[PDB]
């Protein structure tokens, strides 16, 4: 077949089953949701909050920016300068791993989640607490062979739309809904084998190295943010459509580093070279070809993505400051998780030139947490955020506190089985012991007064309820969250 | 007959045993053929049943030739069987001409080891005979089985991995050959210092490009580990 | 008073603490004597209570001098205490003359940590203070406490053993060397290559003629075990 879907080439027929017309979110009170309240995203033609375009159409909307002319490469002379610097730093920090077994890789995978192409079975449907049998079993076997043999496989990514709560506008205004790439189990385990050692290395140096994937906000937060505070200037830099705006050329640069720090590099080269090759995406009726942007399905990608991020940012700074990236990186503390960043630095950074550089790369920062730029930077670490938490400057140190409005929500909505109408009430829920606790502790850090109004809501949410639990004292629980364990 | 009678479920084992020995059905691509004879070597039991027959065929020949009752032969002999592989040790003064005939007469096909020709030879040393593809060797410390150097060398030239079409194709580091790699040292060290050192040549290199690195042991050091274990 | 308040059996603690602080009896051999003042330092909790006083005393001066509410100073300051062992960090503009004067008035005897003279200087750099006889150090990776050259020198030159009257004597092959000797290897890495070689050898020298052999890992390979981990 042939040959254009939302600006992008057709390559084959799709095998993806249709999009979910349903949500997993459920209301906690039947009470009429406050004004301007977030709700689950749009669910198409059967959705009853509005009559709008097909999910098919919504996804086409999401695919627009993959075909956009890519931005420009950093200066060759600055590109290598950094990349060689980043790798040397990892080399001076990362504890060398021992190769990941099939056995290990097969264990890593989020078992609760689709197999991708071609069975599209949730993984759990075929596992033994042990290994994959039947369908996936065979799929898992084949790919593993193609790994050890250092032979190649073409990933076949499946496309979806994230079920999440969104700003109400994004239902009643210009309908938007975020695209996800589902990887296929073959690429999944294959990448897991190839790049699992590296990610593990990253895990266990996520406080000393800017790549914070795998971190604990509570346990690791107070010291990551403490390192940041050690620097004069701090900045949000907030990016629009990160993954779409990516340049494979740089994804290849981060690919190269990753592959360089893998136990079995030659085996890893292949997997990468595949991952990075023009991505085939399964959008229902047709499979199409995505040459640019970050292909997001597999393991790895989030560290891959942060690693790219690391590069792009370090580029702008060297570009603008004129300084050797070793000095920059030693007059600075970074935090990357995917597109979520926070850059702390002692170097006077020409904010005009700096932003310009990023845009030139084809990036899209918005204004920190206001409107319009030149990007801006503060003298204080408070006000910045990361992993959806506001960084807080306390006498007991630094931390992540989930904002008031974010709490209100987690109390307004509960995750359940998939249903048609987000507005129904989940008939006398059970599972809240852990989630209830956390939000009660989240509210702990917002003072004594805020905790009271929360406590009560927690309790009539503990009315028709599985466990007849105590409201502990504020002082007590505030002690519990901050300090641990 | 023997295994059934010797099983916790004779009544049930018989039905199964009759089934195995019944003119066999072998799927050979285009057809399934009837194989009336030879050994049906599929099942678990098989290799035990196979050796059991070998016991029965060796004993018959010895009794046929020496004419000593089978309990006395067996109290005067040590046997070792494994399917077809066999050592036969006896004080009885057996006629090797007369023996081979009986065997051939039963339709067997014995050859003078991989030395070619007979009548089968008998020897007054055990040294030189081999079994499960290791050389039977004896020294000051007792007897042992020693996979020979030619045999060691190949293991250095070939490693197991997934099915593929070209045998000369090379893998990567192959990050699961430490187990196998160790054994090779052991095997080698039983051939004296000269040899082991030149197996210390290769097991070294092929350790560089691999999943982890450990240091190569001392000879006397590993030989001990190899001889008395563990 | 604090310790008791914040202990689960306050009623009973009140006694032991009132006991622990009452004019103390000290057996020096010829006599037991009464010491009414200074720290009575035998008890498990002893070092914490002493740290607790150091805190109290440090704040008392700081607050006197800056004249800021003690909890405020505590949110404009970071403190580390270990018995007599301190590091005081602060954003408050603190008068070093008056601070020195305020303590020497409490009867304390501070000194200039590296030049032996007061008022206490205060630098803009956390580097060059020590805590727990390790020196505070910062590189591009973050901060860490490093043991200095002479102390690691001294730790090689001597070792624990049973009691004896002449210290130059040498016991045989000291077996509890390894677990420590490794750490020494670690702590010297943090001084880089040149020095680390200097220790790498002295380590080899002993440990060989002790238990088994030592693996002497590469300088850059310890640095990672030492700084990061694990």
For every residue of A93-131, DSSP letters joined together read TPPPP----HHHHHHHS-TTSB--TTT--BGGGGB-SS-
Domain ranges, ordered by start, for chain A: 1-19+76-211+248-296, 20-75, 212-247+297-383, 384-485
Q: Taking CB atoms and an 8 Å limit, are C228 and A95 in contact across chains?
A: yes
Beta-bridged to residue C138, according to DSSP, are C143
CA dihedral (A290, A175, A418, A165) in degrees, to 10, reads 100
Which of A64, A84, A89 is CA-nearest to residue A8? A64
Q: Which residues contact C63 (CB under 8 A, 6 or more apart)?
A: C69, C70, C73
Core vs surface per residue A207-219: b (16+ CB within 10 A) or e: bebbbbbebebbe
Task: Say which CATH superfamily domain A212-247+297-383 falls into.
Answer: Reverse transcriptase/Diguanylate cyclase domain (3.30.70.270)
Partner residue opposite A208 with nearest CB, options C71, C142, C225: C142
Q: Which of residues 116-145 of A touch B (CB under 8 A)?
A: 145
- Contact yes or no for A295/A279 (Cβ under 8 A): yes
Q: Using an 8 Å CB-CB cutoff, list chain B residues near A263.
A: 175, 211
CB of C46 within 8 A of CB of C53? no
* Residue B101 CB contacts under 8 Å (≥ 6 apart), including other chains: none
Q: Is A326 an interface residue toward C (CB < 8 Å)?
A: yes
Report, in this order, helix, strand and coil percent for chain C, each rounded to 5. 45, 15, 40
Cα(A328)–Cα(A314) distance, integer angstroms? 8
**A235, burial (CB in 10 Å: exposed 0-12, middle 13-18, buried 19+):** buried
Judge whether C24 and C34 are in contact, CB under 8 Å: yes
The number of beta carbons lying within 10 Å of the beta carbon of residue B179 is 7
CATH number, domain A384-485: 1.20.960.20
Q: How far is CA A449 from the centre of its chain?
A: 33
Is residue A328 within 8 Å of A347, Cβ to Cβ? Answer: yes
**CA distances (Å), origin C138, targets A17, A296, C221:** 56, 38, 19
Reduce the DSSP state of residue A404 to 3 states and report it.
helix
Q: Which residues are bridge partners to B136 per DSSP?
A: B145
Instruction: Say if residues A24 and A149 touch (Cβ distance below 8 Å).
Output: no
CA B40 to chain centre: 19
For residue A227, give every residue at least 6 positions away whose Cβ sits within 8 Å of its Cβ, in sequence order, or none: A207, A333, C142
Q: What angle do CA A27, A30, A32 make, to 5 degrees?
A: 100
Distance CA A451, CA A162 (A): 32
Strand order of the β-sheet with B142-146 is: B130-131, B134-139, B142-146
Instruction: Measure the CA–CA gap between A259 and A55, rounded to whole angstroms.
Output: 37
Q: How large is the C-alpha radius of gyration of chain B? A: 23
Q: Which residues pair with A13 in a beta bridge?
A: A286
**On the CB side of B94, how many CA atoms lie within 13 Å of its CA?**
28
Q: How far apart are CA B44 and CA C230, in angstroms?
A: 48
* E-state strands within A310-393: 332-337, 340-345, 385-386, 389-392
CB proximity list for A156: less than 8 A, separation 6 or greater: A116, A117, A118, A184, A187, A280, A282, A287
Question: Residues B152, B144: contact at Cβ < 8 Å?
Answer: no
Indicate the DSSP class of residue A263. Answer: S
- Count H helices and E strands in chain C, helices first: 9, 7
Alpha carbons within 13 A on the beta-carbon side of C105: 11
Separation CA A18–CA A120 (nearest Å): 11
Domain A20-75 listed as CATH 3.40.50.150: no
Residue A186 has a CB neighbour count (10 Å cut-off) of 26
Contact status of A261 with chain B (Cβ, < 8 Å): no
Q: Rounded to an integer, what distance in angstroms lies between the CA atom of residue C52 and that of residue C74?
A: 14
Q: Tell me whether A53 touches chain B (CB under 8 Å).
A: no
Residues 6+ apart with CB under 8 A from A50: A42, A171, A172, A175
Chain B residues touching A267 at Cβ < 8 A = 172
Report the DSSP beta bridge partners of residue A340.
Answer: A337
Instruction: For domain B129-230, say whether CATH 1.10.1740.10 is its number.
Output: no
How far, in Å, are A144, A308, B199 from residue A335 at the CA level? Answer: 34, 13, 50
In B, minimum Cα distance to A96 occurs at B212
Asked whether B53 and B45 are in contact (CB, 8 A), the reply is no
**Nearest residue to A478 (alpha-carbon basis) of A465, A449, A380, A223:** A449
Q: 3-state class of A429 per DSSP?
A: coil
Question: Cα(C174)–Cα(A276) distance, rounded to whole angstroms?
Answer: 57
Look up residue A47 and give its two tokens.
């959705």
Q: Give the span between the Cα atoms of C68 and C88, in whole angstroms.
A: 16
Q: Could you count the other beta carbons within 10 Å of the beta carbon of residue A184? A: 27
Dihedral angle sign, alpha carbons of residues A15, A16, A17, A18: negative
Q: Which of A205, A223, A224 to mutate to test the interface with C (most CBs of C within 10 A)?
A: A205
CA pair distance B182, B179, nearest whole angstrom: 6
- Contact of C75 with chain A, judged by CB distance below 8 Å, is answered with yes
C74: contact with A, CB 8 A cutoff: yes
Closest CA to A40 of A405, A419, A387, A443: A419
Spell out which residues of chain C touch residue A97, defining contact as CB-CB under 8 Å. Answer: none
Strand ranges for chain B from DSSP E: 24-27, 32-35, 77-82, 85-90, 130-131, 134-139, 142-146
Residue to substitute from B172, B210, B214, interface A, most A β-carbons within 10 A:
B172
- What are the residues whose beta carbons fall under 8 Å from the beta carbon of B22, sequence distance 6 or more? none
Q: What sign has the CA pseudo-torsion A395, A397, A403, A404? A: negative
Where does B96-223 show beta strands of DSSP type E? 130-131, 134-139, 142-146
Q: Residue A89: which residues within 8 A CB-CB, separation 6 or more? A: A209, A329
Could you tell me which of B67, B68, B74, B110 has the C-alpha nearest to residue B89?
B74
CATH number assigned to the domain with residue range C42-128, chosen from the 4 options 3.10.580.10, 3.40.50.300, 3.40.50.720, 3.30.70.270: 3.30.70.270
**C107-125 burial: b if 16+ Cβ within 10 Å, else e:** eeeeeeeeeeebebeeeee
Task: Give the integer Cα–Cα distance in Å for A227 and A231.
Answer: 8
Measured in angstroms, the CA of C164 and the nearest CA of chain A are apart by 44
Structure token pair of residue B210: 């691999």
């Amino acid at each position: 077949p042939s040959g254009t879907y939302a600006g992008l080439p057709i390559a084959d027929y799709g095998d993806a089953p249709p999009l979910s017309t349903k949500t997993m979110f459920w209301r906690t009170s039947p009470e009429k949701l406050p004004p301007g309240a977030w709700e689950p995203a749009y669910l198409g033609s059967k959705d009853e909050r509005v009559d709008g375009p097909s999910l098919q159409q919504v996804m086409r909307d999401q695919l627009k920016p993959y075909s956009e002319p890519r931005g420009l490469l950093p200066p060759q002379e600055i590109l290598d300068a950094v990349c060689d610097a980043i790798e040397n730093r990892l080399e001076n920090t990362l504890e060398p791993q021992k190769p990941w077994t099939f056995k290990k890789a097969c264990e890593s995978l989020d078992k609760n989640t689709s197999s991708g192409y071609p069975y599209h079975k949730q993984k759990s449907k075929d596992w033994t607490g042990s290994a994959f049998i039947g369908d996936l079993g065979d799929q898992a076997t084949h790919a593993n062979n193609m790994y050890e043999m250092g032979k190649s496989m073409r990933p076949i990514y499946t496309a979806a739309l994230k079920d999440e709560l969104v700003k109400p506008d994004k239902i009643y205004g210009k309908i938007k809904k975020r695209l996800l790439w589902g990887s296929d189990l073959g690429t999944m385990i294959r990448a897991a084998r190839a790049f699992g050692p590296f990610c593990d290395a990253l895990k266990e140096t996520c406080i000393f190295n800017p790549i914070r994937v795998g971190m604990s906000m509570n346990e690791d937060g107070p010291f990551i943010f403490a390192r940041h505070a050690n620097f004069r200037y701090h900045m949000d830099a907030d990016y629009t459509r990160w993954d779409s705006t990516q340049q494979r050329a740089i994804l290849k640069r981060a690919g190269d580093i990753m592959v360089r720090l893998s136990p079995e590099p030659d085996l890893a080269r292949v997997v990468m070279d595949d991952l990075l090759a023009p991505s085939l995406l399964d959008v229902g009726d047709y499979k199409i070809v995505v040459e640019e942007g970050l292909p997001s399905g597999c393991p790895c990608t989030t560290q891959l993505n942060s690693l790219a991020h690391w590069i792009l940012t370090l580029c702008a700074m060297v570009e603008v400051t004129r300084v050797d990236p070793d000095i920059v990186m030693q007059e600075s503390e970074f935090s990357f998780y995917g597109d979520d960043e926070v850059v702390s630095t002692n170097l006077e950074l020409d904010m005009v030139k700096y932003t310009m550089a990023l845009r030139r790369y084809g990036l899209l920062p918005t204004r920190a947490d206001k409107e319009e730029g030149p990007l801006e930077r503060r003298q204080t670490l408070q006000g910045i955020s990361f992993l959806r938490r506001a960084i807080v400057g306390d006498q007991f140190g630094w931390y992540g506190r989930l904002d008031r409005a974010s709490i209100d929500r987690q109390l307004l909505w509960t995750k359940g089985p998939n249903h048609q109408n987000p507005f129904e009430t989940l008939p006398g829920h059970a599972q809240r012991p852990s989630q209830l606790m956390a939000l009660l502790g989240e509210a702990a850090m917002h003072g004594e007064k805020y905790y009271r109004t929360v406590a009560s809501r927690v309790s009539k949410e503990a009315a028709q309820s599985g466990i007849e639990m105590v409201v502990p004292r504020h002082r007590s629980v505030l002690r519990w969250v901050r300090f641990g364990t």
